[PDB]
């Protein structure tokens, strides 16, 4: 006898698991046992992923409700997984998107600048070099303190939380919660700090003394920022790193994108749509019974999103492993999720990884992994898949 499959299937992302298109092929939907012991379902094909994620009644917001199927322990209080729902009933949604596109003047001079520092600093220490904690991962922390209105000093710090905030854990804890309160008392007193005067916490601390947003609690314009730094840099550092081991172990393609830098936003979009940084599928609740493909989903069942089952749908993305720059549909992949809660800072996260990789060819255009890349040490139990170290010579 055999247990119910278990998910995740693997931390690695630099591989996409065979199974993958054999649940695709034969059962795109299907039960399996989660870290937590309940049972949910997997949806794998891209046909059935958009229908779970363009239909309402599967809600994010019921993930958090008491005796649920979970995923995972909750790493933020319940009312936060309403987070973008809480923004939009505050009527801060426009001022939140604004803050955050990559258009603002000089914020990718800014990406630029930092991006050569960066690579810089590593030239002049010498290979090897690790594009994680000394490329990827600050490069996200400068940009989203700036983003944000505050320091650029104060962005290690609250990246130290992000290895625990964003864990994928059987169970509640501990850890999560004093870096949580802690980081809330610091975004509480930057709302408070008369310096913060641009950016996204210059911005709300405006509107939180705006009669118009008199009764916006403090809670919800702290939590903000936190949330808005914890998601923004953990995706763009995990989503830079792992494109940055694509592009390397493709060398042809390190070379024409290196010769041809107008080709890079095509490019960064295939490395979003084969990208495996997710380490779970997208999570919601069924609040009725709904039909999905051939299983009756009953009100109260937990549904799992796999995005790279539907990115690498070749009935959707012919030849769906292969990086092709002239595709006709090339940014209807589910990278940046869809419907309601499709990601807001997808362009800011587009032009992050487009300006790191224009940085890094023009600086390292021999960029090559520095160890087997069997030797990656794969993050687990974490909401990305990450390598902890990436070492490379150039
Ligand atoms: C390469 C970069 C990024 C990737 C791949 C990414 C991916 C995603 C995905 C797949 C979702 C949907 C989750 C779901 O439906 O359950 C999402 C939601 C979200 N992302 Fe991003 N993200 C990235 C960058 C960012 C940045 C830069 C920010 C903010 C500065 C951000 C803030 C958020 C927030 C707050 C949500 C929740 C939206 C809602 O529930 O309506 N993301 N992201
Ligand atoms: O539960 C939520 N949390 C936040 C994202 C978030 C920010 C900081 C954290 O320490 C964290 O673990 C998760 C949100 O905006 N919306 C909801 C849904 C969500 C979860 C994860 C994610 O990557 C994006 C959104």
Redesign the pocket.
Known sequence: ATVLLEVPFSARGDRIPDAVAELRTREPIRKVRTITGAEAWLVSSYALCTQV?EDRRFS?KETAAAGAPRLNALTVPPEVVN??GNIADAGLRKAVMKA?TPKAPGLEQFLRDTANSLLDNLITEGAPADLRNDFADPLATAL?CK?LGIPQEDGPKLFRSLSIAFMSSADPIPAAKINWDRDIEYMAGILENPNITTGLMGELSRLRKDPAYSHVSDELFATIGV??FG??VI??GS?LTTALISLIQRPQLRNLLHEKPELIPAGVEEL?RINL??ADG?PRLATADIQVGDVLVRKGELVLVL?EGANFDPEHFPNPGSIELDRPNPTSHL???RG??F???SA??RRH?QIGIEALLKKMPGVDLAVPIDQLVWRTRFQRRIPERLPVLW
């Open positions: 994620l994010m987070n973008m955050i989203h983003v949330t808005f998601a923004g995706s763009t989503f979003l940084s997710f997208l995005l990278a940046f999720g309601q809660h990601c807001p800072g800011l996260g990884a």
